[PDB]
Amino acid sequence: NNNLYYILLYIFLEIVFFGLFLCLYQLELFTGFLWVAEFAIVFIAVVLLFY
Amino acid sequence: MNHYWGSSNTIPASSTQNNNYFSGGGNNVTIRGNEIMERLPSQTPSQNMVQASMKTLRFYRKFCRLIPFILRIHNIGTKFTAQQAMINFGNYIRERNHYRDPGLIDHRIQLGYELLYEAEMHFSQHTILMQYLSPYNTPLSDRGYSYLEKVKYGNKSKFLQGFYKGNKPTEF
Amino acid sequence: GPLNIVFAGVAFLMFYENNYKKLYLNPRYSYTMPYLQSAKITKNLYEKL
Amino acid sequence: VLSNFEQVNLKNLRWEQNFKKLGLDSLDQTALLASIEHEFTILFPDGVFEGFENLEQVVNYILKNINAV
Amino acid sequence: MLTWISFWSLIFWLILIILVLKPKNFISILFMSELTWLALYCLSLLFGAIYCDITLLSISFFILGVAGLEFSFGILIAILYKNLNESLNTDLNNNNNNQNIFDKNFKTPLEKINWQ
Amino acid sequence: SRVRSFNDFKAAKTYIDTLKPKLACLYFRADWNPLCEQADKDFDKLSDTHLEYEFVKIDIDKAPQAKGYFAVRCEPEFLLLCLGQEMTRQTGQNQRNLEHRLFKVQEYVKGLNFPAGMDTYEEFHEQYMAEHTQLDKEINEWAR
Amino acid sequence: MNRSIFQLWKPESPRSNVNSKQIKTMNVNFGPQHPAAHGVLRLILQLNGEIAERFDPHIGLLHR
Amino acid sequence: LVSCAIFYKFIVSKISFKNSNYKDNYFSIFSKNYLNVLFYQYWSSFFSSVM
Amino acid sequence: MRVDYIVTPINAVVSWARQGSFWPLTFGLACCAVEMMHATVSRYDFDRFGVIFRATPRQADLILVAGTLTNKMAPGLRRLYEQTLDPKWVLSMGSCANGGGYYHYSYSVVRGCNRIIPVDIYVPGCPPTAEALMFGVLQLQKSLYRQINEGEKKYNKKDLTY
Amino acid sequence: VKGKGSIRKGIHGEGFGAPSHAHDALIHQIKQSKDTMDYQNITNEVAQNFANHQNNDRWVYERRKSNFIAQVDYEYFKFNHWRTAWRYFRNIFLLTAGVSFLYNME
Amino acid sequence: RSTQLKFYDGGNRQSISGIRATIFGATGFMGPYIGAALGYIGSDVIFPHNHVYAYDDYVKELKLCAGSGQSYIMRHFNYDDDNMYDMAIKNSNVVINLVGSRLQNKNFQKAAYANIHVAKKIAEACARNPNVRRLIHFSAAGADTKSPSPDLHTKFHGEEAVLNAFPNATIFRPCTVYGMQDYFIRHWIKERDWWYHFNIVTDDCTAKRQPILINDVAQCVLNALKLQESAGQIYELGGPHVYSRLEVFEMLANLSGRPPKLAHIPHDIALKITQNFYNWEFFNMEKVIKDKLDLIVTGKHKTISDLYVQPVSFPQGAEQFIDDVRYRGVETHDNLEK
Amino acid sequence: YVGYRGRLQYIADALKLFIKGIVVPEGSNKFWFVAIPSAAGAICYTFWINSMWGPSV
Ligand SMILES: CCCCCCCCCCCCCCCCCC(=O)OC[C@H](COP(=O)([O-])OCC[N+](C)(C)C)OC(=O)CCCCCCCCCCCCCCCCC
Ligand SMILES: NC(=O)C1=CN([C@@H]2O[C@H](COP(=O)(O)OP(=O)(O)OC[C@H]3O[C@@H](n4cnc5c(N)ncnc54)[C@H](OP(=O)(O)O)[C@@H]3O)[C@@H](O)[C@H]2O)C=CC1
Ligand code: SF4
Ligand SMILES: [Zn+2]
């Protein structure tokens, strides 16, 4: 995939799956932190695309 | 050039580049500009008929260059081609050929530029602006036509055709 | 087809074998299979359900 | 492009004739030049546009152009 | 179906390979670099849990910080791409013919070459 | 070889797809262009001269659909194909340029190498549709 | 309080890409059916980051 | 830390100079040296840091 | 026949709802607009009858033409009417909208908004008082409530509609 | 001229550039005509800008698009590509999970 | 009886043409166009209707076919009482019947009621009134006494009944009519938009069609009114060329750029499912039955050329109605500006 | 006046919003146009799991 928006969406889903692995392996706390941080980043990334 | 037609009033090719690298460019002639027009100054006065004729020719050239863009954005390409629209507007100009006052011609050129700008920026409606591009004695291409009065009044003169078809309602 | 029938047979045997080894040949002290294990109240730490 | 202008006969059309003797007045000349200009996706400079007298000069100019597509 | 250690080592190296593979758009490379940092984050947490080591969790949050600063730098560098006459697709910033691009075509800014 | 004339698009396409030529030259003609009279003679002469090509002439007036299928824009058109893939295209009437294009395509193809099993004939649109699902399909899924 | 005058205004120079408009301006219709446009005001507005740069007030939509 | 300091040093390099070339007014000249320096330093730092 | 057993009651629930929340479009021309805004404020509360104004035509149920319509505005009014979500109703308020009005003999005024879009009801005054505007809106609400079942179907021998 | 570098002032004219430098026609038009443009004059620079802009889209202009040929797809609802997947999956499952499971159960 | 009808067509909306017309069945697709063709020259038009939802745009916009004081909408029409028919055409010298079995309808009794009973009542009311000069009845091109479609069978029977009751009535049989709100192009667009991947076809698509634009049927009606020799004649109206259904699919695909995909379902399954299940606009027996039948000008009667109308070609006339649904693929940078 | 003394205003508003017929403009992505509201509703109908009404309730 070469569309920037779809690349961003798939990377967001990858972050979700990384957090899911951390949850399964029983590092729950680090799932809560990682997500929010990267979530903010993803948000900013979207704005960058808009520009 | 601080004008709507200035060479720097083109839409950038990309968000980080006006054109490809190593150079610049942009289309301002066959499409609309980047910024909106904010003022349209007066035409410089023409002292004789030569200058007025040159102004008319240049206005017609700009109109012809802008025809395909207007046809695309207004969805009127099936009613007539670009060349047909140019020919119809040329018929309009030819019907305005007898003019001989240069100031009147400058005024008309100003009005023509204004109407062209209105057409190219979706200010007017397509069914309204098509009155300047429509054929004079030919049906439009997007629909069928009736040739009943051609068959019945075949060789009859114009007077007889206008006599058989009245000029007022007949109930009253 | 025959191979589909064979696959269905193997799947059914797998399913039944798993269920049989969960129901029997297995201690039943925690509630895992509903409506097949007892839902009573246990007073001792080790009571069979 | 010239097919749209139906007052011009393409059968024995010789390209050295002036536009007027082909049946095109100034407005038709401007329309035809703009149509060719759109056809090849180029622009004619103001001196070049107003200096054209026949189709041979237009053909030569388009031949010498590298941006014509 | 694969052990987590081998899986995550392979995932990190595959992420690097895919980062190299994709067309050189600065924003895409920024996103893939962020993904690489996150893969390092996950691997460090996994080994910290396996070996009962508390420094690797620190590596996780330090990765978060380093990746954040790097992302800020990347955003600024892209906006710098805006002002300079450069394309976010670096393959369009040179005249080297590329068969991977359908429509790569550059010519000199001249209307004609010969006059006489 | 010898020119095969066609007035029906479906029959001509069936003939070409059954023949599966390695080198083909298609001459699309229409009656609006007065220069098409000389193009017929040029096509006949080049067809009898060259034997590595298959020469097929299509009347656009009697087979309008063919035009849309072959992206014909300005008749007369000479479309040179290798294994169904568009080698080149010429618009206008000039025998020397047509022969030069035929010679260039012939020599370049004769200097080519194809892996076994990947040198089969393909239809024309097959090249356009392959890139359509690669570029146009995804663009239309984002804008619309 | 330091000078921020250069961040405030951006002039234009002939054939200067960095001094020109490096963006497609947002040309919006502040048209008649707008709560802040009163009844008939059709104002062609050029916005660049929600900053009003160019005005084109079309009046006469209530000329009787 | 030192790599960030070196990046800061590279950023504050002087870009435009007062010279005796008076032919370049009213024309756009692209240098592109600043962007290349920043880009290559940035990505080399990224690769070294991750490894 | 049996479907009516479900359809006929439910119809009322469909009408009542759309009678209880009748949202007009925020659009006012000239000085019937001022009178309408008077009709919206606390002295005459449309919010009593569940009438609240929405600014976009996609969320509007009633188009309220309340001012003079010029030849410059007719395509815009046509587009605004076309871009409203169905079902929709149109109220014509004041003389300039019902007919030409005080500018019927002018060169730039549409001689009635019903030459461009269909009109469901007309309010005559110049300006019609907020009393009269509320009267017209209430009449339209009752009419559109009753409009779903006006006895179009015939009853068979079992007293069942079609 | 004070505060103007090497620009010199001649008779009847202040001068706009350093000596022996080429005079620019666009800047002449800018100075003489502040905002007045009688018509969009197409100079060499304007035509060159147009050519530069249109060269970016040369591939689209030269693209030869073929019209579609309609057909009635009789096999669309069979979903053959999903049956191949099913055959592959059941073969793999039987040859790996099935044999081992049956042997271990026995 | 007198078939003469003198009127002035050189006027505008506020003129007086001299035609007072009643149009039945104007709550469909033809209605607004026929009414506008009559009332745009200054005629008086009356629209009797009994429409399920009175607030639907199919009723309100009928008021736009003429000006204030010229167009009237008669509501709650019985379609069963002779008095209402007499009241509808009391002062009308022109009557047009557009009533016909709707596409959703699959009941034979309702089809006969729409195509035979109502037409017979209209013709009988016209015969009683001595001031009616011309009556134009709308039928179908493929109408036949042995048609598997109940619509075409009942339309042939209605032709017989109308010609029996009012021997000076004019019968129009359009082939298939397309426009902005039609069942040919709009249905194609909506079916492709809903079934995102395909258009459903239940046959080999070898049936023939002769599409004609809606703007040409109105001109045909006006020409027939102007021609006194068309009083007791049957006219079949179609486009210049005949296409198969597959060719129409391909032409619609090429005009818009959408790649065609025709998923095939066997005819008997579709017939059974449409027979035993509820039918609406986009799922009914009529589409399945008609897709195997040719609706073209057969040459047994007079054609559109006898009305001195030159219909527009299908590719040229259908292009403007698919401008919004054009495929958005690889385009130039200048195409971004709209 | 919706119900008795305005007791059913919210019910009437919700039912009318259900009744209104949505149209998707051309030039927009139909999938995204319909999918973003679905995701928004699914997200907003999750907040109630992040609620506390008494200790450990
Ligand atoms: C893409 C734009 C930038 C995205 C930035 C990051 C966004 C993060 C998520 C924000 C919310 C919006 C996403 C969800 C809705 C859209 C789904 C999507 O993107 O599908 C794309 C994907 C892919 O898009 P596609 O199918 O159009 O792409 C085709 C392939 N290419 C890219 C080549 C054109 O969609 C599908 O695979 C099919 C549709 C599946 C939709 C399944 C979810 C629907 C919504 C359910 C409710 C939401 C989830 C549950 C609630 C939330 C958790 C508690
Ligand atoms: N459009 C086409 O493609 C072609 C159409 N025709 C015929 O031309 C005529 C007009 O066409 P068109 O407008 O498109 O068709 P429609 O199906 O859209 O309209 C049918 C009209 O008849 C009315 N009607 C239907 N059933 C009954 C009934 N039982 N009692 C009373 N009125 C009824 C409908 O009103 P309501 O349902 O609201 O009561 C509506 O006004 C029809 O007879 C049609 O079959 C012929 C050839 C081609
Ligand atoms: S009808 Fe009269 S009072 Fe009302 S808006 Fe018109 S001018 Fe004002
Ligand atoms: Zn019978």
PDB file of N, CA, C and O in Angstrom, chain B residues 71-98:
ATOM      1  N   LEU B  71     -16.760  24.310 -20.246  1.00  0.00           N
ATOM      2  CA  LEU B  71     -17.603  23.189 -20.648  1.00  0.00           C
ATOM      3  C   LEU B  71     -17.477  22.027 -19.674  1.00  0.00           C
ATOM      4  O   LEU B  71     -18.473  21.375 -19.343  1.00  0.00           O
ATOM      5  N   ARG B  72     -16.258  21.745 -19.209  1.00  0.00           N
ATOM      6  CA  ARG B  72     -16.075  20.652 -18.262  1.00  0.00           C
ATOM      7  C   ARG B  72     -16.723  20.967 -16.919  1.00  0.00           C
ATOM      8  O   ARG B  72     -17.461  20.142 -16.369  1.00  0.00           O
ATOM      9  N   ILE B  73     -16.466  22.158 -16.372  1.00  0.00           N
ATOM     10  CA  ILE B  73     -16.949  22.447 -15.025  1.00  0.00           C
ATOM     11  C   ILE B  73     -18.452  22.682 -14.987  1.00  0.00           C
ATOM     12  O   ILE B  73     -19.063  22.552 -13.921  1.00  0.00           O
ATOM     13  N   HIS B  74     -19.076  23.023 -16.114  1.00  0.00           N
ATOM     14  CA  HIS B  74     -20.507  23.291 -16.134  1.00  0.00           C
ATOM     15  C   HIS B  74     -21.331  22.138 -16.693  1.00  0.00           C
ATOM     16  O   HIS B  74     -22.560  22.245 -16.735  1.00  0.00           O
ATOM     17  N   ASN B  75     -20.692  21.044 -17.110  1.00  0.00           N
ATOM     18  CA  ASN B  75     -21.388  19.851 -17.600  1.00  0.00           C
ATOM     19  C   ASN B  75     -22.312  20.186 -18.771  1.00  0.00           C
ATOM     20  O   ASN B  75     -23.491  19.827 -18.790  1.00  0.00           O
ATOM     21  N   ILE B  76     -21.765  20.887 -19.759  1.00  0.00           N
ATOM     22  CA  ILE B  76     -22.540  21.291 -20.926  1.00  0.00           C
ATOM     23  C   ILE B  76     -21.816  20.863 -22.195  1.00  0.00           C
ATOM     24  O   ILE B  76     -22.073  21.397 -23.279  1.00  0.00           O
ATOM     25  N   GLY B  77     -20.914  19.889 -22.069  1.00  0.00           N
ATOM     26  CA  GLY B  77     -20.142  19.439 -23.212  1.00  0.00           C
ATOM     27  C   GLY B  77     -20.926  18.616 -24.211  1.00  0.00           C
ATOM     28  O   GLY B  77     -20.491  18.480 -25.359  1.00  0.00           O
ATOM     29  N   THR B  78     -22.066  18.056 -23.802  1.00  0.00           N
ATOM     30  CA  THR B  78     -22.868  17.260 -24.723  1.00  0.00           C
ATOM     31  C   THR B  78     -23.774  18.121 -25.592  1.00  0.00           C
ATOM     32  O   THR B  78     -24.155  17.695 -26.687  1.00  0.00           O
ATOM     33  N   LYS B  79     -24.127  19.322 -25.130  1.00  0.00           N
ATOM     34  CA  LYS B  79     -24.992  20.192 -25.919  1.00  0.00           C
ATOM     35  C   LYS B  79     -24.276  20.735 -27.145  1.00  0.00           C
ATOM     36  O   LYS B  79     -24.922  21.045 -28.152  1.00  0.00           O
ATOM     37  N   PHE B  80     -22.955  20.860 -27.078  1.00  0.00           N
ATOM     38  CA  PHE B  80     -22.134  21.395 -28.154  1.00  0.00           C
ATOM     39  C   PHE B  80     -20.669  21.183 -27.810  1.00  0.00           C
ATOM     40  O   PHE B  80     -20.301  21.095 -26.636  1.00  0.00           O
ATOM     41  N   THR B  81     -19.846  21.092 -28.849  1.00  0.00           N
ATOM     42  CA  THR B  81     -18.411  20.956 -28.674  1.00  0.00           C
ATOM     43  C   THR B  81     -17.782  22.320 -28.398  1.00  0.00           C
ATOM     44  O   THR B  81     -18.447  23.358 -28.420  1.00  0.00           O
ATOM     45  N   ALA B  82     -16.477  22.306 -28.123  1.00  0.00           N
ATOM     46  CA  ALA B  82     -15.764  23.555 -27.882  1.00  0.00           C
ATOM     47  C   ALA B  82     -15.772  24.442 -29.120  1.00  0.00           C
ATOM     48  O   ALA B  82     -16.008  25.653 -29.028  1.00  0.00           O
ATOM     49  N   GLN B  83     -15.536  23.850 -30.294  1.00  0.00           N
ATOM     50  CA  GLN B  83     -15.496  24.624 -31.529  1.00  0.00           C
ATOM     51  C   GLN B  83     -16.853  25.239 -31.840  1.00  0.00           C
ATOM     52  O   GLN B  83     -16.934  26.378 -32.313  1.00  0.00           O
ATOM     53  N   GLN B  84     -17.933  24.498 -31.585  1.00  0.00           N
ATOM     54  CA  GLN B  84     -19.270  25.038 -31.808  1.00  0.00           C
ATOM     55  C   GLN B  84     -19.545  26.224 -30.891  1.00  0.00           C
ATOM     56  O   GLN B  84     -20.140  27.221 -31.317  1.00  0.00           O
ATOM     57  N   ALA B  85     -19.123  26.137 -29.627  1.00  0.00           N
ATOM     58  CA  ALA B  85     -19.295  27.258 -28.709  1.00  0.00           C
ATOM     59  C   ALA B  85     -18.498  28.473 -29.167  1.00  0.00           C
ATOM     60  O   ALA B  85     -18.993  29.609 -29.116  1.00  0.00           O
ATOM     61  N   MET B  86     -17.258  28.253 -29.617  1.00  0.00           N
ATOM     62  CA  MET B  86     -16.462  29.355 -30.147  1.00  0.00           C
ATOM     63  C   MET B  86     -17.142  29.993 -31.350  1.00  0.00           C
ATOM     64  O   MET B  86     -17.166  31.220 -31.476  1.00  0.00           O
ATOM     65  N   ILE B  87     -17.703  29.175 -32.241  1.00  0.00           N
ATOM     66  CA  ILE B  87     -18.355  29.706 -33.434  1.00  0.00           C
ATOM     67  C   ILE B  87     -19.607  30.496 -33.065  1.00  0.00           C
ATOM     68  O   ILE B  87     -19.890  31.542 -33.656  1.00  0.00           O
ATOM     69  N   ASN B  88     -20.373  30.017 -32.083  1.00  0.00           N
ATOM     70  CA  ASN B  88     -21.567  30.750 -31.663  1.00  0.00           C
ATOM     71  C   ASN B  88     -21.209  32.101 -31.046  1.00  0.00           C
ATOM     72  O   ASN B  88     -21.836  33.126 -31.357  1.00  0.00           O
ATOM     73  N   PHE B  89     -20.199  32.130 -30.175  1.00  0.00           N
ATOM     74  CA  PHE B  89     -19.792  33.416 -29.618  1.00  0.00           C
ATOM     75  C   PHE B  89     -19.184  34.322 -30.683  1.00  0.00           C
ATOM     76  O   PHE B  89     -19.334  35.550 -30.615  1.00  0.00           O
ATOM     77  N   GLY B  90     -18.498  33.746 -31.671  1.00  0.00           N
ATOM     78  CA  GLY B  90     -18.039  34.536 -32.796  1.00  0.00           C
ATOM     79  C   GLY B  90     -19.181  35.120 -33.597  1.00  0.00           C
ATOM     80  O   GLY B  90     -19.066  36.221 -34.132  1.00  0.00           O
ATOM     81  N   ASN B  91     -20.290  34.388 -33.700  1.00  0.00           N
ATOM     82  CA  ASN B  91     -21.491  34.934 -34.324  1.00  0.00           C
ATOM     83  C   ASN B  91     -22.021  36.121 -33.533  1.00  0.00           C
ATOM     84  O   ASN B  91     -22.457  37.123 -34.112  1.00  0.00           O
ATOM     85  N   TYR B  92     -22.000  36.016 -32.205  1.00  0.00           N
ATOM     86  CA  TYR B  92     -22.357  37.154 -31.357  1.00  0.00           C
ATOM     87  C   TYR B  92     -21.483  38.370 -31.669  1.00  0.00           C
ATOM     88  O   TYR B  92     -21.984  39.479 -31.919  1.00  0.00           O
ATOM     89  N   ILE B  93     -20.164  38.167 -31.683  1.00  0.00           N
ATOM     90  CA  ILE B  93     -19.237  39.266 -31.949  1.00  0.00           C
ATOM     91  C   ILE B  93     -19.465  39.840 -33.344  1.00  0.00           C
ATOM     92  O   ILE B  93     -19.407  41.059 -33.547  1.00  0.00           O
ATOM     93  N   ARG B  94     -19.724  38.973 -34.325  1.00  0.00           N
ATOM     94  CA  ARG B  94     -19.996  39.429 -35.683  1.00  0.00           C
ATOM     95  C   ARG B  94     -21.260  40.273 -35.734  1.00  0.00           C
ATOM     96  O   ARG B  94     -21.329  41.261 -36.474  1.00  0.00           O
ATOM     97  N   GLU B  95     -22.280  39.889 -34.967  1.00  0.00           N
ATOM     98  CA  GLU B  95     -23.462  40.729 -34.844  1.00  0.00           C
ATOM     99  C   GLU B  95     -23.156  42.044 -34.142  1.00  0.00           C
ATOM    100  O   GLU B  95     -23.941  42.990 -34.257  1.00  0.00           O
ATOM    101  N   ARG B  96     -22.040  42.128 -33.418  1.00  0.00           N
ATOM    102  CA  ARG B  96     -21.594  43.397 -32.854  1.00  0.00           C
ATOM    103  C   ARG B  96     -20.481  44.056 -33.672  1.00  0.00           C
ATOM    104  O   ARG B  96     -19.726  44.870 -33.132  1.00  0.00           O
ATOM    105  N   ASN B  97     -20.366  43.728 -34.963  1.00  0.00           N
ATOM    106  CA  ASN B  97     -19.266  44.243 -35.777  1.00  0.00           C
ATOM    107  C   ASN B  97     -19.433  45.708 -36.158  1.00  0.00           C
ATOM    108  O   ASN B  97     -18.433  46.408 -36.349  1.00  0.00           O
ATOM    109  N   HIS B  98     -20.669  46.187 -36.294  1.00  0.00           N
ATOM    110  CA  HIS B  98     -20.912  47.532 -36.803  1.00  0.00           C
ATOM    111  C   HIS B  98     -20.513  48.634 -35.830  1.00  0.00           C
ATOM    112  O   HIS B  98     -20.691  49.809 -36.162  1.00  0.00           O
TER     113      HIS B  98
END
